């Protein structure tokens, strides 16, 4: 039942650290990194939670319509702005990253001495989102600075860019 | 019951990574970083587990008889060699560090929305060592490359250097 510790550490040792000074680093990119143009990166941190726990080290490997734009300026943690493409053109920009602890779950199910099957993994990943949802709920302001994008995959097709673009548009209003 | 996830992640995402190429990086420091002298740093990774979960960011703050000697050479993870002093003179050298996840436990008990008392912390820290002991047992070779130094503190006095120097000598034979 590793999910509990996974969620607490991820909030306590990461989110609660970067999330407070988050929107600031963004308006800095949007308004103080250029003279000629205002940037339009969303205000929130988008966290990918594939319940499959696959974490490609390049999001273009997950979707060529997700392209790295720039590093979120600092103030040390490194974050990444991405543009999302739709029909060959930019539909949004946000800071985007995987929830790193899913790597632990993935790796746990590739390691014999753990007795960890794909079904264990899934059961644990879902548990992880729910625990994290709950922590962020009872955590002041934090829940508002970020949005959780949990998803699985069928056997049709799946667009990660469309998935993000949803919240990226559903938040414009 | 965060300890389980804490232990698995610490093994899966850290120990199982650095421990394999560990003794190599040490003999490199001991035999290939100098021409005139052979180094005498121990072969194992010494992991501090204060059940109090206090982690000072300088081990000289924990014990002035523990002094930073050098960074363990690489091959990216950074590690630290320490000399241990006894009566003003060097009694051993080893690579030494805290088990980082105890920070999560410490911080959890300083954060209201968690319902985490000192007693919760202790109960959880001990749980963490035991889980980690068990993982390292059923993990080939790994258990041999490292030694776990769990300890609490009274209300007499406690020497961290003496504690380490124990294993540092109990391993010489």
From Swiss-Prot, chains A, B:
Coiled-coil region(s): none
Subcellular location field: Endoplasmic reticulum membrane; Cytoplasm, Perinuclear region; Endoplasmic reticulum-Golgi intermediate compartment membrane; Golgi apparatus membrane
Tissue: Ubiquitously expressed. Expressed in skin endothelial cells, alveolar type 2 pneumocytes, bronchial epithelium and alveolar macrophages.
Post-translational changes noted in the entry: Phosphorylation by TBK1 leads to activation and production of IFN-beta. The phosphorylated pLxIS motif constitutes an IRF3-binding motif, leading to recruitment of the transcription factor IRF3 to induce type-I interferons and other cytokines. The phosphorylated pLxIS motif facilitates SENP2 recruitment during late phase of viral infection. Phosphorylated on tyrosine residues upon MHC-II aggregation.
UniProt binding sites for 2',3'-cUAMP: 14, 100
Cross-link (Glycyl lysine isopeptide (Lys-Gly) (interchain with G-Cter in SUMO)): 173
Residue positions where Phosphoserine is found in the record: 78
Residue intervals annotated with topology Cytoplasmic: 1-173
Residue ranges, annotated region (Cyclic dinucleotide-binding domain (CBD)): 1-173
Signal peptide extent: none
Superkingdom assignment: Eukaryota
Effect seen on changing residue 110 to A: Abolished translocation from the endoplasmic reticulum in response to cGAMP-binding. Reduced phosphorylation by TBK1
Recorded consequence of changing residue 2 to M: In SAVI; constitutively active mutant that promotes the production of type I interferon in absence of cGAMP ligand
Positions contributing to 2',3'-cGAMP binding: 9, 14, 100
Binding site for 3',3'-c-di-GMP: 9, 14, 76-78, 100
Record: disease: STING-associated vasculopathy, infantile-onset: An autoinflammatory disease characterized by early-onset systemic inflammation and cutaneous vasculopathy, resulting in severe skin lesions. Violaceous, scaling lesions of fingers, toes, nose, cheeks and ears progress to acral necrosis in most of the patients. Some patients have severe interstitial lung disease.
Described purpose of this protein according to its UniProt entry: Facilitator of innate immune signaling that acts as a sensor of cytosolic DNA from bacteria and viruses and promotes the production of type I interferon (IFN-alpha and IFN-beta). Innate immune response is triggered in response to non-CpG double-stranded DNA from viruses and bacteria delivered to the cytoplasm. Acts by binding cyclic dinucleotides: recognizes and binds cyclic di-GMP (c-di-GMP), a second messenger produced by bacteria, cyclic UMP-AMP (2',3'-cUAMP), and cyclic GMP-AMP (cGAMP), a messenger produced by CGAS in response to DNA virus in the cytosol. (Microbial infection) Antiviral activity is antagonized by oncoproteins, such as papillomavirus (HPV) protein E7 and adenovirus early E1A protein. Such oncoproteins prevent the ability to sense cytosolic DNA.
Miscellaneous: The cGAS-STING signaling pathway drives sterile inflammation leading to type I interferon immunopathology in severe COVID-19 disease caused by SARS-CoV-2 virus infection. Tissue damages in the lung and skin lesions are caused by activation of the cGAS-STING signaling leading to aberrant inflammation. Endothelial cell damage is also caused by activation of the cGAS-STING pathway: SARS-CoV-2 infection triggers mitochondrial DNA release into the cytosol.
Subunit-level organization: Homotetramer; in presence of cyclic nucleotide (c-di-GMP or cGAMP), forms tetramers and higher-order oligomers through side-by-side packing. Interacts (when phosphorylated) with IRF3; following activation and phosphorylation on the pLxIS motif by TBK1, recruits IRF3. Interacts with RIGI, MAVS and SSR2. Interacts with RNF5 and TRIM56. Interacts with TBK1; when homodimer, leading to subsequent production of IFN-beta.
Comment on protein domains: In absence of cGAMP, the transmembrane and cytoplasmic regions interact to form an integrated, domain-swapped dimeric assembly. In absence of cyclic nucleotide (c-di-GMP or cGAMP), the protein is autoinhibited by an intramolecular interaction between the cyclic dinucleotide-binding domain (CBD) and the C-terminal tail (CTT). Following cGAMP-binding, the cyclic dinucleotide-binding domain (CBD) is closed, leading to a 180 degrees rotation of the CBD domain relative to the transmembrane domain.
Family to which the UniProt record says this protein belongs: Belongs to the STING family.
Name of the protein described by the UniProt record: Stimulator of interferon genes protein
The gene coding this protein: STING1
Full-protein positions shown: 154 to 338 of 379
């Amino acid at each position: 039942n590793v999910a509990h510790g996974l969620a607490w550490s991820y909030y306590i040792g990461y989110l609660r650290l970067i999330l407070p000074e988050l929107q600031a680093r963004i308006r800095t990119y949007n308004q103080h990194y250029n003279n000629l143009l205002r940037g339009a990166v969303s205000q929130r941190l988008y966290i990918l939670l594939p319940l499959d726990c696959g974490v490609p080290d390049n999001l273009s490997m997950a979707d060529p319509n997700i392209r790295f734009l720039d590093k979120l300026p600092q103030q040390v943690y490194s974050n990444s702005i991405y543009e999302l493409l739709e029909n060959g053109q930019r539909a949004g920009t946000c800071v985007l990253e995987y929830a790193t602890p899913l790597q632990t779950l993935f790796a746990m199910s590739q390691y014999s001495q753990a007795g960890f099957s794909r079904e264990d993994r899934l059961e644990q990943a879902k548990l992880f989102c729910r625990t994290l949802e709950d922590i962020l709920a009872d955590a002041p302001e934090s829940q508002n600075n970020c949005r959780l994008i949990a998803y699985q995959e069928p056997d049709s097709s799946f667009s990660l860019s469309q998935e993000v673009l949803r919240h990226l548009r559903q938040e414009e209003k």
